[PDB]
Design a protein around this ligand. Sequence first.
Ligand SMILES: O=C(O)c1cc(-c2c[nH]nc2F)ccc1Oc1ccc2ccccc2c1
Lengths: 114, 114, 114
Amino acid sequence: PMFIVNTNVPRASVPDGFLSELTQQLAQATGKPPQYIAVHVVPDQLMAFGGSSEPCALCSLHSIGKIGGAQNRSYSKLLCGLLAERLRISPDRVYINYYDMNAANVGWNNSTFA
Amino acid sequence: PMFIVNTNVPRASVPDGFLSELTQQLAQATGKPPQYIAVHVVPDQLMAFGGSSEPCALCSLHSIGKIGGAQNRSYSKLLCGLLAERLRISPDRVYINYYDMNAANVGWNNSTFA
Amino acid sequence: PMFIVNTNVPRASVPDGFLSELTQQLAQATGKPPQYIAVHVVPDQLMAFGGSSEPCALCSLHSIGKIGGAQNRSYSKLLCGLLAERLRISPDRVYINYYDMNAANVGWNNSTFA
Ligand SMILES: O=C(O)c1cc(-c2c[nH]nc2F)ccc1Oc1ccc2ccccc2c1
């Protein structure tokens, strides 16, 4: 799986160990070994949520399967919680886009997961 | 709706008010309240369009519905116009990817929109 | 097509000519004129792959058709090869998400490709 966070929160406000914490938390949540989990945090972004430049985040989670109604609700609770506690971003200023990827459409190690 | 612009135009060339203008005009275009509109502008990018490093932009617009043939043509006219006027990027060096998101696949405020 | 690379590799390790090489090699592989190819490289990213901060890349390739099992494998070999040779990223620390875009959902030059 792949989790990306774009945020206007500055680089110095991203705790050391945030990437490792996201990796571990997502491995637990997706039921996948941490070796397949990729995380990407992009601070200092020029963005607005509802016309406002208060702290916000635009995120995505891509996974081959393990994507759906209840799972996405549980991921949103998890990830907003982490963004609230660690980056001090209110949950109502976070979007997370979920993508269920087909294995043939994910390249890795010179081939795909097909 | 979420609008993201990635561009090789420098940060100094993005005028004051640009994020607010994008939010307002997307609100006008989509009819949707400005409170749920998210905008993100990423200048100074290393990119090429047709092998040339003249000003260009790679964009995306995600919406839960309000995506389709006529609507996307209308959004393209609007957004290319704004990019041409404000960032001096030619419309023929802009790509905009449109995504019709399922409400179950958009996380917000510890849940999703389903 | 449009090809985007996000990587923790520093800007100085991206060789001169890299965008042009990507454009030419993608034009070659897809059998398309280089005028249709857009490329975007984002170095210096805060990212991990499997909890490790060794060199890695998170990429996407968007195309209007010409996406599928065999073609995606061929693209992965090509693009992993380039990232390995030029950026010294191991192929098993690269993800490439492939997207088959509908022509109606790609904006360009004030309209869409529909
Ligand atoms: O090579 C592509 O598929 C292609 C892809 C993009 C693109 C930009 N963001 N996401 C994308 F997928 C843009 C132009 C392209 O050239 C065209 C454009 C229209 C076409 C219509 C029919 C058949 C082939 C076509 C090829």
